[PDB]
Coordinates of C-alpha atoms and ligand atoms in Angstrom, one line a residue:
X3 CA -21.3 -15.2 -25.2
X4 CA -19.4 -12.4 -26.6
X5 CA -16.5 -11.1 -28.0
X6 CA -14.1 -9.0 -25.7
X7 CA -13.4 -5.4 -26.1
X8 CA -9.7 -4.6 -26.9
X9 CA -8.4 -1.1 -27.7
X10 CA -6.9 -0.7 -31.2
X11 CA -4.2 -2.5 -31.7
X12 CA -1.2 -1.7 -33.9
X13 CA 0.3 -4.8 -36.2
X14 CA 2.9 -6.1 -34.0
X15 CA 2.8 -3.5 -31.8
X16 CA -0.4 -4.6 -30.6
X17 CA -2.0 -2.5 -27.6
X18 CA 1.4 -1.2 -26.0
X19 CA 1.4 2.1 -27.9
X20 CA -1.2 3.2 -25.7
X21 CA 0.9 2.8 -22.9
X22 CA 4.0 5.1 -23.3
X23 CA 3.8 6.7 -20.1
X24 CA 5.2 6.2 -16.4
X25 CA 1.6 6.3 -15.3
X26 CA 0.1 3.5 -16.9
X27 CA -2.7 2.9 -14.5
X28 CA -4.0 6.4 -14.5
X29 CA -4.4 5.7 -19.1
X30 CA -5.2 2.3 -18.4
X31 CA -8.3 4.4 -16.4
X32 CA -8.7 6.3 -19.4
X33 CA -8.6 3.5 -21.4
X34 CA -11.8 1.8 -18.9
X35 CA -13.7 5.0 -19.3
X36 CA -13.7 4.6 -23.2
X37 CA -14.3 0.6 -23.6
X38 CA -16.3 -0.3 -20.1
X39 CA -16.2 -2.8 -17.3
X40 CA -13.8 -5.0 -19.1
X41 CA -11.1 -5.2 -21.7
X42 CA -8.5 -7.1 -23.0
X43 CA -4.7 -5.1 -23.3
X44 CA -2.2 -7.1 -25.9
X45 CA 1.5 -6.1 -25.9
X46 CA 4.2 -8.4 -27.9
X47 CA 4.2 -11.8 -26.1
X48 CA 1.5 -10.5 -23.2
X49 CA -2.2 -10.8 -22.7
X50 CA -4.2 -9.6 -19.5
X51 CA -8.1 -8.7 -19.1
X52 CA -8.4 -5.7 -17.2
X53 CA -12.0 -5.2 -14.9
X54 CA -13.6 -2.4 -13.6
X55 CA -17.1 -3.0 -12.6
X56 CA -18.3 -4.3 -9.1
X57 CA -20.7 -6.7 -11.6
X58 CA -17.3 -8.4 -12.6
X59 CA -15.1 -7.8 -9.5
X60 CA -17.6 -9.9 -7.7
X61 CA -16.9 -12.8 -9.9
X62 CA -13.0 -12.6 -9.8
X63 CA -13.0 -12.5 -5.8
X64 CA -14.6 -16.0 -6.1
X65 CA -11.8 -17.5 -4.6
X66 CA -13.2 -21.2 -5.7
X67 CA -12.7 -19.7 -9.3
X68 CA -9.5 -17.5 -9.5
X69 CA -6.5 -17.5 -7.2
X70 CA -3.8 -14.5 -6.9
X71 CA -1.5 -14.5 -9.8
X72 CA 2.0 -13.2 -9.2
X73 CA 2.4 -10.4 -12.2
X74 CA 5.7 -9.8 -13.6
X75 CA 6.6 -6.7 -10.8
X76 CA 6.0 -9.2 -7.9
X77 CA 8.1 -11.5 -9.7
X78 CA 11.3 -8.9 -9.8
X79 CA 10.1 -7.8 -6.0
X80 CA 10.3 -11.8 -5.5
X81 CA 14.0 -11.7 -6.0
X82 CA 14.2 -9.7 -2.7
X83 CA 11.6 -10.5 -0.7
X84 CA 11.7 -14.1 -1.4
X85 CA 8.4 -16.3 0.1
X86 CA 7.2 -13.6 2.1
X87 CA 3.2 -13.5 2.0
X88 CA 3.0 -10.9 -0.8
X89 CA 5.4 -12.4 -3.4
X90 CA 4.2 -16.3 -2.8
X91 CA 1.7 -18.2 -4.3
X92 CA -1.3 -19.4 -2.3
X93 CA -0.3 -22.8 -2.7
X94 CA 3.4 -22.5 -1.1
X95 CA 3.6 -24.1 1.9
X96 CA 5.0 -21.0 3.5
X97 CA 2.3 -19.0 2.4
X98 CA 0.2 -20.7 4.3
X99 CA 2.2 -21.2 7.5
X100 CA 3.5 -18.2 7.8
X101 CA -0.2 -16.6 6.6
X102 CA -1.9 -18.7 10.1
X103 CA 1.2 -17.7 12.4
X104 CA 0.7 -13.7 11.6
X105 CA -2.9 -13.4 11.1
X106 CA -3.3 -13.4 15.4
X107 CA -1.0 -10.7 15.4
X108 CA -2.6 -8.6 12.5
X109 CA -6.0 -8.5 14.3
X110 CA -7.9 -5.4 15.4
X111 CA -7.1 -6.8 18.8
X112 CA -3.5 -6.8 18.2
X113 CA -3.2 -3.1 16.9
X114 CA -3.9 -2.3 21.3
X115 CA -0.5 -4.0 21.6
X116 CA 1.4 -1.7 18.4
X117 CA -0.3 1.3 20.0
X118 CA 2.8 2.8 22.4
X119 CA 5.1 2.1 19.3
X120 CA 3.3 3.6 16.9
X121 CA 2.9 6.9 19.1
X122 CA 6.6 6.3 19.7
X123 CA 7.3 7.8 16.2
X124 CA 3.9 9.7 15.6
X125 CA 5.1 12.4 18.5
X126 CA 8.6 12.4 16.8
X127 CA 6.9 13.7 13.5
X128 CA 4.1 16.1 15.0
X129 CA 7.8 17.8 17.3
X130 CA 9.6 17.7 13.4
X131 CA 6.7 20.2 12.5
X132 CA 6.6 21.9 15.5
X133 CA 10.2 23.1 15.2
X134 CA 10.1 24.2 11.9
X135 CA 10.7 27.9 11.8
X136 CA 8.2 30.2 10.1
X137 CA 9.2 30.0 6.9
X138 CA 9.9 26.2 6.1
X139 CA 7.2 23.7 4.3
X140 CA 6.8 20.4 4.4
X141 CA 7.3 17.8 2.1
X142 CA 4.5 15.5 2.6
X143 CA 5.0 12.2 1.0
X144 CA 8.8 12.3 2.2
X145 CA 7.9 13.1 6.0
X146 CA 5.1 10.2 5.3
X147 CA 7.3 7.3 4.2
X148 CA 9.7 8.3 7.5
X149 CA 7.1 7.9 9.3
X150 CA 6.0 4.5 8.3
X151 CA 9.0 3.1 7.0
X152 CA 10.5 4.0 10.6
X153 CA 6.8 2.7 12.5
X154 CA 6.8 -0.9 10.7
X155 CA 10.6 -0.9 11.7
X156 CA 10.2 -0.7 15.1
X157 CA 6.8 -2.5 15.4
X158 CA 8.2 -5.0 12.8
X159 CA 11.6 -6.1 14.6
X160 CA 12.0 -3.1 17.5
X161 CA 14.6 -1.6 15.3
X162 CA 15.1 2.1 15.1
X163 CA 16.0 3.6 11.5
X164 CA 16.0 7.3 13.3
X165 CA 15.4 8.6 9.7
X166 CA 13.9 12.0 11.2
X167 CA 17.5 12.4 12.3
X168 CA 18.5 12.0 8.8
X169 CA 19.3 13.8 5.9
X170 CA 20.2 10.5 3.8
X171 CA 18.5 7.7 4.9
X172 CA 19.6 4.5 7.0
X173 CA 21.4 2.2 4.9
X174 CA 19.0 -0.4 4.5
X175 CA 16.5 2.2 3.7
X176 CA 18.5 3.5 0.9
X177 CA 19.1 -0.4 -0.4
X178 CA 15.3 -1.1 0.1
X179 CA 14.3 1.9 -2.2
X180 CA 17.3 1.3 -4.6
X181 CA 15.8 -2.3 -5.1
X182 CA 12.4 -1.8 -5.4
X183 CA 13.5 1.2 -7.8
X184 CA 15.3 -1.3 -10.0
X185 CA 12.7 -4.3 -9.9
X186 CA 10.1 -1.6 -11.3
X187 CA 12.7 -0.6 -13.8
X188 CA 13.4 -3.7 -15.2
X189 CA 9.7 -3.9 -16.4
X190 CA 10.6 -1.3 -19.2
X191 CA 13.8 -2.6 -20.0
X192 CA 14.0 -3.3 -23.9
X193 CA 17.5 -5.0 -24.3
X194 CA 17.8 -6.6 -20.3
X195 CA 21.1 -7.9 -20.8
X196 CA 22.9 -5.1 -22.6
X197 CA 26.3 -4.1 -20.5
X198 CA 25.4 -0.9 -19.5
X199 CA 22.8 -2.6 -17.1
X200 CA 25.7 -4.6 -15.1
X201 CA 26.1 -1.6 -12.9
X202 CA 22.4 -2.3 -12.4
X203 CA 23.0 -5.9 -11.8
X204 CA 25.7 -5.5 -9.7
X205 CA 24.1 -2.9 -7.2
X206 CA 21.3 -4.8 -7.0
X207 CA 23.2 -7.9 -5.7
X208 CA 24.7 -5.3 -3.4
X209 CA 21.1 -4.1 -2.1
X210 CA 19.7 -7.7 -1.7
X211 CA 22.8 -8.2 0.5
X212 CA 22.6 -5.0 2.6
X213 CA 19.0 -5.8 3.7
X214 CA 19.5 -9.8 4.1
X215 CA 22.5 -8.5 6.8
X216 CA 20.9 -6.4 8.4
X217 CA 17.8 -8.6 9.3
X218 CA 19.6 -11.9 9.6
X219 CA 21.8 -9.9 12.3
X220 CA 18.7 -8.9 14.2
X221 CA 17.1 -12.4 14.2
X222 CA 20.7 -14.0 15.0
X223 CA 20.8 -11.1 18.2
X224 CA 16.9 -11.8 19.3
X225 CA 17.6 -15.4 19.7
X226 CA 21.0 -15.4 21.3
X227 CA 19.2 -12.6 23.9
X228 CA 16.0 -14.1 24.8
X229 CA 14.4 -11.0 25.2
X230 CA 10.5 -10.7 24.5
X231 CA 9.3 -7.6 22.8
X232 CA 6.0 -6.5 21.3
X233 CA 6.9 -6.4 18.0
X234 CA 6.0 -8.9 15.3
X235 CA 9.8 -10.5 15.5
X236 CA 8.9 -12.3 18.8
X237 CA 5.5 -13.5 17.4
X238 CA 7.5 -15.1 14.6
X239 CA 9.9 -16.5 17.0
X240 CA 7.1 -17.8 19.6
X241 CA 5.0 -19.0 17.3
X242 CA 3.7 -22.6 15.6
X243 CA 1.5 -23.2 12.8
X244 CA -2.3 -24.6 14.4
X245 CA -2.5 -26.6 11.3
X246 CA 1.0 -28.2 10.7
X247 CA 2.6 -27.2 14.4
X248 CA 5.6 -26.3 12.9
X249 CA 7.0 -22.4 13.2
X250 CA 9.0 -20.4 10.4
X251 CA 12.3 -21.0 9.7
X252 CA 15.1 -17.7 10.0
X253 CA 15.3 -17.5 6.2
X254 CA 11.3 -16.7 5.9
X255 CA 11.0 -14.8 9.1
X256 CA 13.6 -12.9 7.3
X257 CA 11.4 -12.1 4.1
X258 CA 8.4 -11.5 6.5
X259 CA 10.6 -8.4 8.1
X260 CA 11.6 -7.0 4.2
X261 CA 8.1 -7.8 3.0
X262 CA 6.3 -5.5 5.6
X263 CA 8.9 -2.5 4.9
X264 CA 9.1 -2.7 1.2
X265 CA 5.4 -3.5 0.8
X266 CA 3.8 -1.4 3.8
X267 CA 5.2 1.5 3.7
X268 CA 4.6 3.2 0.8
X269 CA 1.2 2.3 0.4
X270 CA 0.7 3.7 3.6
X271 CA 2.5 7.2 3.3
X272 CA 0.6 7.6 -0.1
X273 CA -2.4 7.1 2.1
X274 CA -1.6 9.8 4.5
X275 CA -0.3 12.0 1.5
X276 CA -3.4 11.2 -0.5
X277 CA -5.9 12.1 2.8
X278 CA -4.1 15.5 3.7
X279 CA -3.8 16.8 0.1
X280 CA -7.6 16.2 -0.4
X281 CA -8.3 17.8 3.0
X282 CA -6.4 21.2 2.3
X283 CA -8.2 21.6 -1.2
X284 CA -11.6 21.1 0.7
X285 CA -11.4 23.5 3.6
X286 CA -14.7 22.3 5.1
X287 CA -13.8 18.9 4.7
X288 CA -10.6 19.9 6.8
X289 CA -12.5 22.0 9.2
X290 CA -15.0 19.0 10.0
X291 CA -12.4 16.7 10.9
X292 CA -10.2 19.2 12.4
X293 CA -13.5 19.4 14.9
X294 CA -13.5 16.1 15.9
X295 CA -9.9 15.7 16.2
X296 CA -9.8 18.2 18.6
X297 CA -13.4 17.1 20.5
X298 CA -11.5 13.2 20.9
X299 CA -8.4 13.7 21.3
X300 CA -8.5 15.5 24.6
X301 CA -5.0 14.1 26.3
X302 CA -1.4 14.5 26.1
X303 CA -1.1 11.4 23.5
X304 CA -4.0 9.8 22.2
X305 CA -5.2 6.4 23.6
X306 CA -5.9 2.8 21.0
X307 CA -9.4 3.8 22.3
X308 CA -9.6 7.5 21.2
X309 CA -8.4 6.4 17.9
X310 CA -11.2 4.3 17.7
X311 CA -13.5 6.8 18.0
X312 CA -12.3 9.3 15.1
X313 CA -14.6 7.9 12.7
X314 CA -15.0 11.0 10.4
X315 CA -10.3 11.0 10.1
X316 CA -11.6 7.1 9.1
X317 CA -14.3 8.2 6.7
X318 CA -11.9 10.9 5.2
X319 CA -9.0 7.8 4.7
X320 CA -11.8 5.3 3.1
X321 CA -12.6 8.1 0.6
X322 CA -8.6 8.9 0.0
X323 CA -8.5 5.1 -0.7
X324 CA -11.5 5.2 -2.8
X325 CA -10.2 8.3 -5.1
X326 CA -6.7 6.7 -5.2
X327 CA -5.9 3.4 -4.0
X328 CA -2.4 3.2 -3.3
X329 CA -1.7 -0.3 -4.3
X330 CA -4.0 0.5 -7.2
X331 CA -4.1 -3.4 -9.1
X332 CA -3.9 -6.9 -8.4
X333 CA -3.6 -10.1 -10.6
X334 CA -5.8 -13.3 -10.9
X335 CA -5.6 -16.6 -12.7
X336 CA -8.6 -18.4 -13.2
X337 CA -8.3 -21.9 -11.7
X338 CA -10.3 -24.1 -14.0
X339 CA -11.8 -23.1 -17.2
X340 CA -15.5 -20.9 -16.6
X341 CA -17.2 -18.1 -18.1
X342 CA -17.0 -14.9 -16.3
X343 CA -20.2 -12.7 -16.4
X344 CA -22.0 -15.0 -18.6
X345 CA -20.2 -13.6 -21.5
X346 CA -16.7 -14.0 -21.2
X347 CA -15.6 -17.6 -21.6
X348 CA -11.7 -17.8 -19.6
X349 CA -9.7 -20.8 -20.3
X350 CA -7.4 -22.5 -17.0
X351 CA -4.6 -20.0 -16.4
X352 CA -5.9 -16.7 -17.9
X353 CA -4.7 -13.7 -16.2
X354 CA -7.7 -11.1 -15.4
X355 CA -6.4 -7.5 -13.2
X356 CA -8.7 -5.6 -10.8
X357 CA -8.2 -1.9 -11.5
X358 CA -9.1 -0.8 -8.4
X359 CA -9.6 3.2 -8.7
X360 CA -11.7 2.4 -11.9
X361 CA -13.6 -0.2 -9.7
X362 CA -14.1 2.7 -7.3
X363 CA -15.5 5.1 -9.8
X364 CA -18.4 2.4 -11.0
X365 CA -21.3 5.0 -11.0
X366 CA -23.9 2.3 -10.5
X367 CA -22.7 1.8 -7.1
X368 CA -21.4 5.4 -5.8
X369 CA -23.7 7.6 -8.4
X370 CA -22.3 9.6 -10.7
X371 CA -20.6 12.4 -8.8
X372 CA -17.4 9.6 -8.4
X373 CA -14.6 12.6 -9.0
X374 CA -15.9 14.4 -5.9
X375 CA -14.0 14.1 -2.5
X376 CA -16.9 13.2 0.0
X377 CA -16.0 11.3 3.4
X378 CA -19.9 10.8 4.0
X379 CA -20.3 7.9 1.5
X380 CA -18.5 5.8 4.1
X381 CA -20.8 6.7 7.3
X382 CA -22.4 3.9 6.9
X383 CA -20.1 1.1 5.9
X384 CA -22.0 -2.5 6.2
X385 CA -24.9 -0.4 3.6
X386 CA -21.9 -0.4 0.9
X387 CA -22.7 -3.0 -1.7
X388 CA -20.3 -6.5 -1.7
X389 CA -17.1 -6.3 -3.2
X390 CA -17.2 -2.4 -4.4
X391 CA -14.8 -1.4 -2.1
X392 CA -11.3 -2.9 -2.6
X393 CA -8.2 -1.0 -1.4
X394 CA -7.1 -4.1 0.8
X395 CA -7.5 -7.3 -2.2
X396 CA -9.8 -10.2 -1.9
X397 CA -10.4 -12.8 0.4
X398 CA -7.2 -15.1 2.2
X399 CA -5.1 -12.6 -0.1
X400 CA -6.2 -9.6 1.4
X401 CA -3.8 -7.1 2.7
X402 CA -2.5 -8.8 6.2
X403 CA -1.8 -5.3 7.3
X404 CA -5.0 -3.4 6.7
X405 CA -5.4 -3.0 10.9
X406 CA -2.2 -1.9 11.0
X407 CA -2.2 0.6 8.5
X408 CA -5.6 2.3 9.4
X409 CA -4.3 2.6 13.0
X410 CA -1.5 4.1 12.0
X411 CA -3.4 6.3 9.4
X412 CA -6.0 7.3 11.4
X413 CA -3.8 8.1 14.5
X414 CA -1.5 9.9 12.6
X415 CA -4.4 12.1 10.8
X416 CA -5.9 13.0 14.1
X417 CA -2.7 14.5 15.4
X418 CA -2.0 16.0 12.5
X419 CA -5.4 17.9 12.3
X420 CA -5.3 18.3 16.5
X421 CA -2.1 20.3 16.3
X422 CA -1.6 21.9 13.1
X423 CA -3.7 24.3 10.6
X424 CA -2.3 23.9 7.6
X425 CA -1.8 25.8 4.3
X426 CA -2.0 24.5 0.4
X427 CA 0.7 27.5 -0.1
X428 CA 1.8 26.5 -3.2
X429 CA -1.8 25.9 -4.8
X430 CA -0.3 22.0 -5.3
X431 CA -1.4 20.5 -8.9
X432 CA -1.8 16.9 -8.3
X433 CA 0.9 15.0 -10.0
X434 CA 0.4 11.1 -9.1
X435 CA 3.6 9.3 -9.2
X436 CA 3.1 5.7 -10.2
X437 CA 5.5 3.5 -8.6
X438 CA 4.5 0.2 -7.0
X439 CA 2.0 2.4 -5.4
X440 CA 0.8 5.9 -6.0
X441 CA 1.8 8.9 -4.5
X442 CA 1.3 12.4 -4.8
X443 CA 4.7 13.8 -5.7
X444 CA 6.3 17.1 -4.7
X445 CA 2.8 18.0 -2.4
X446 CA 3.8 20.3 0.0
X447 CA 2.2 22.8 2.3
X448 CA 2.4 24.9 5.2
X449 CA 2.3 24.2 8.6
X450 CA 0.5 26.4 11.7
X451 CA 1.0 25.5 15.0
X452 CA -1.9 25.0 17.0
X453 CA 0.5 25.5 20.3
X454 CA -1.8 22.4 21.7
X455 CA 0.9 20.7 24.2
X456 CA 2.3 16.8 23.8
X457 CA 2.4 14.5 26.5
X458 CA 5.8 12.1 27.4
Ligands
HEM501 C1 -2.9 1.8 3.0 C2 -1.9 0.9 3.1 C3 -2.0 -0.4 2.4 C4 -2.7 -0.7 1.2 C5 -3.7 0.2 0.3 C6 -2.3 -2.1 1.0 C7 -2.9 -2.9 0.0 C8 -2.7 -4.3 -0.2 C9 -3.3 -5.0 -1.3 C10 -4.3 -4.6 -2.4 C11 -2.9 -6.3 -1.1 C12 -3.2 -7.5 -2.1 C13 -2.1 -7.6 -3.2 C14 -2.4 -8.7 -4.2 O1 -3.5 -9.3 -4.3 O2 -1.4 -9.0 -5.0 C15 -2.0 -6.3 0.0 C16 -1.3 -7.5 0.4 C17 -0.4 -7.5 1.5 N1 -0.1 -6.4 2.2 FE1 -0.8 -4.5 2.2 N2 -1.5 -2.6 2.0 C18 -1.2 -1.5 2.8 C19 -0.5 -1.6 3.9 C20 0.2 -2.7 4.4 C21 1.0 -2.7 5.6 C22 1.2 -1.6 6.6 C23 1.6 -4.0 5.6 C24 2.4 -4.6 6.7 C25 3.0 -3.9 7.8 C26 1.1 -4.7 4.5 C27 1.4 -6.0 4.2 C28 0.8 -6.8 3.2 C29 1.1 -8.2 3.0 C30 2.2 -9.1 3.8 C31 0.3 -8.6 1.9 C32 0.2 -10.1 1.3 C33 -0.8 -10.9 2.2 C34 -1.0 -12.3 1.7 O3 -1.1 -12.5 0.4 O4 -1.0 -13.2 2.5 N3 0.2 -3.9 3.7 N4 -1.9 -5.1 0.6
LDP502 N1 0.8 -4.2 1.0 C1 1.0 -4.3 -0.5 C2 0.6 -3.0 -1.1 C3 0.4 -3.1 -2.6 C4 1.2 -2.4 -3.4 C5 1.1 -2.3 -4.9 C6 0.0 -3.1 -5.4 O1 -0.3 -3.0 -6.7 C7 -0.9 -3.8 -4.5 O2 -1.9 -4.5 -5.1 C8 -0.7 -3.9 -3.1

């Protein structure tokens, strides 16, 4: 039994001076490196433990000991994505229900069925590059986030935002981003209820009702047509509950449709972002995947089962996601009172956070070269210790929509590197945004056409 590290604190201040920064994981990181696999981080009226080594990590995914705890900026996402899976507690009855309906149709198995869809918009982004003239850039985390947001759209509820046809965004896409910029806003807000924040208020209301609209319409249109699609709105429609035999009501179904937008799609561009920025600054890297894109990928439009088969574009995404997880922390309560490590006595209700890219950087498990990009730690995956690899979360709370976004990943990667060569133009300084997720802002490069034909 021992005492906790804790950085300095400062009177009344306590720990937060530490934190003046809009990229508080990347010093809470810093903070790791300095005081070890655990410390506790004190700000006026606030206490959380923040872990770091796989010896830990272990522990806290005991799910008979500690339970997802909704932090504060789930809390303010709650007010617009309602009891959807990410913002409920596991002991909700619509967590659960809604948790055994979608499961089926988040399944490796079901990604075969999302396939067409995905390639849908896939071929409209590689034809956006393919008709830019010679000398126009991308920008990489913007043509990302079209991508997915547009993907889980149409996969989601067969609804097409068309936001490569766009300059400003679809109106719900504008509202979703304008409320998730707010609910992260509001955690840095000194003086909350100050007047000039009823603009705030106000458009917020606004946002909430845009996307509610929108998606109520959608549902209200499925129902009255009958029609059967592939995408996850009929599965919600069709579908009962094993356990209680019931199915979700329109309200929830509703939050389901907002929660896999606002919470999918940005960890997901950051992904591809991430995986493309650390493949132009390591050319070989690039070339060895660029190899086996082109040795798979050998029709018009790639097939659920050539996907399958680009293991090295999946090695180079697990190492992205090692380096920097894009939903890089989530919360814990313990359950009942116990001692964590055999040192750290918790009582019922204490709050503990996984950092995840410090977790990934635990040189007992990788070695010590942990800064270096290097796909081949992942050729082996079932060799890689329990619980050291975390991108997805723990246990029942695990990302629902890790199949789904690795398909999509590792598609789009391969036909990416298939068609294009591409060019770091600008020599890109990494600059890693910190919003709900991470993201590699203003990365940009160049394009090359390959002139490899699509298919239709
Ligand atoms: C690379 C992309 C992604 C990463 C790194 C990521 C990561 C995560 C993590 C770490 C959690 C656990 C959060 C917690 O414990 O508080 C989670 C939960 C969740 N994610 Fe993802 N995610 C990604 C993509 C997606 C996609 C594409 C979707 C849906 C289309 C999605 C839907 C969900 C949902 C609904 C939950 C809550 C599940 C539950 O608690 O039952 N995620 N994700
Ligand atoms: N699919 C949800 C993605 C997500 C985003 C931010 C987080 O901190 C996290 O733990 C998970």
């Amino acid at each position: 039994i021992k005492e906790m590290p804790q950085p300095k604190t400062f009177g009344e201040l306590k720990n937060l001076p530490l934190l003046n920064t809009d990229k508080p994981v990347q010093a809470l990181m810093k903070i790791a490196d300095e005081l070890g696999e655990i410390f506790k981080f004190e700000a006026p009226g606030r206490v959380t433990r923040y872990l770091s080594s796989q010896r830990l990590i272990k522990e806290a995914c005991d799910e008979s000991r500690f339970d997802k705890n909704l932090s504060q900026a789930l809390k303010f996402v709650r007010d617009f994505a309602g009891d959807g899976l990410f913002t409920s507690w596991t002991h909700e009855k619509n967590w659960k229900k809604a948790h055994n309906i979608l499961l089926p149709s988040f399944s490796q198995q079901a990604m075969k069925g999302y396939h067409a869809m995905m390639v849908d918009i896939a071929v409209q982004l590689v034809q956006k590059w393919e008709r830019l003239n010679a000398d126009e850039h991308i920008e990489v985390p913007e043509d990302m986030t079209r991508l997915t947001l547009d993907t889980i759209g149409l996969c989601g509820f067969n609804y097409r935002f068309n936001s490569f046809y766009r300059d400003q965004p679809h109106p719900f896409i504008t509202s979703m981003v304008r409320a998730l910029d707010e609910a992260m806003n509001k955690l840095q807000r000194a003086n909350p209820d100050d007047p000039a924040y009823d603009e705030n208020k106000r458009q917020f209301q606004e946002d909430i009702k845009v996307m509610n609209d929108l998606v109520d319409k959608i549902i209200a249109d499925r129902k009255a047509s009958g029609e059967q699609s592939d995408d996850l709105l009929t599965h919600m429609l069709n579908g009962k509950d094993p356990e209680t035999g019931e199915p979700l009501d329109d309200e929830n179904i509703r939050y389901q449709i907002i929660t896999f937008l606002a919470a999918g799609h940005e960890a997901t561009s950051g992904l591809l972002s991430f995986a493309l920025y650390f493949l132009v600054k390591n050319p070989h890297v690039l070339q060895k995947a660029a190899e086996e894109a082109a040795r798979v990928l050998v029709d018009p439009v790639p097939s659920y089962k050539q996907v399958k088969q680009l293991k090295y574009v999946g090695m180079v995404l697990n190492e992205a996601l090692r380096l920097w997880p894009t939903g890089p922390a989530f919360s814990l309560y313990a359950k009942e009172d116990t001692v964590l490590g055999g040192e750290y006595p918790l009582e019922k209700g204490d709050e503990l956070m996984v950092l995840i890219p410090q977790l990934h950087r635990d040189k007992t498990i990788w070695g010590d070269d942990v800064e270096e990009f290097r796909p081949e730690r992942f050729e082996n995956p079932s060799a890689i210790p329990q619980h050291a690899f975390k991108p997805f979360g723990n246990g029942q709370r695990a990302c629902i929509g890790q199949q789904f976004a690795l398909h999509e990943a590792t598609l789009v990667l391969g036909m990416m590197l298939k068609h294009f060569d591409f060019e770091d133009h600008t020599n890109y300084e990494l600059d890693i945004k910190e919003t709900l997720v991470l993201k590699p802002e203003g990365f940009v490069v160049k394009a090359k056409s390959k002139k490899i034909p699509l298919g239709g």
